[PDB]
């Protein structure tokens, strides 16, 4: 599914991401835009052989099992394919574990390079939430 901007913000809000660990909703919308262009079916291979899945590009090196990332972990305890669903629950619940792992949203390179230090509230401007 390709979400609209405000549609995704509302879904993320209902799943408890607004100010989760102190990250306002616009941070999560901005990260999703630059990680996946709001497309739940986004996949992207990494140089080390791991793959990133779904709207928040969660990587199989640590967080999910795809059966083809040798020597990896599965700390969200889910198949990576679950992260491609039009239902974002699994992506959001796994993201809550990632953002709590000590580095906050710096775990998402695109967030650090494209969202951090910008006016992220613009990403939710106009939305009925
Ligand atoms: Cl947009
Ligand atoms: Cl914030
Ligand atoms: Cl959903
Ligand atoms: Cl933090
Ligand atoms: Na915001
Ligand atoms: Na894995």
Swiss-Prot record:
Tissue occurrence: In the egg white and polymorphonuclear leukocytes.
Keywords: Allergen, Antimicrobial, Bacteriolytic enzyme, Disulfide bond, Glycosidase, Hydrolase, Secreted, Signal
Cysteine-cysteine disulfides: 6-127, 30-115, 64-80, 76-94
First-listed, main subcellular location of the protein, grouped into a coarse class: secreted
Active site residues according to the UniProt entry: 35, 52
Enzyme Commission number, as recorded: 3.2.1.17
Gene Ontology CC annotation, any one: cytoplasm
PANTHER family hit by this protein: LYSOZYME C
Family: Belongs to the glycosyl hydrolase 22 family.
Protein name (Swiss-Prot/TrEMBL): Lysozyme C
Species whose genome carries this gene: Gallus gallus (Chicken)
């Amino acid at each position: 599914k390709v979400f609209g901007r405000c549609e995704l913000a509302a879904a993320m809000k209902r799943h408890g991401l607004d100010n989760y660990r102190g990250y306002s909703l616009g941070n999560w919308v901005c990260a999703a835009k630059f990680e996946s262009n709001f497309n739940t079916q986004a996949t992207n291979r990494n140089t080390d052989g791991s793959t990133d899945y779904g709207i928040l590009q969660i990587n199989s090196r640590w967080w999910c099992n795809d059966g083809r990332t040798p020597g990896s972990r599965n700390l969200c305890n889910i198949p990576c394919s679950a992260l491609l669903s039009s239902d974002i629950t699994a992506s959001v619940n796994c993201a809550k574990k990632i953002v709590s792992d000590g580095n906050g949203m710096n775990a998402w390179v695109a967030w650090r390079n494209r969202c951090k230090g910008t006016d992220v509230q613009a990403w939710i401007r106009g939305c009925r939430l």
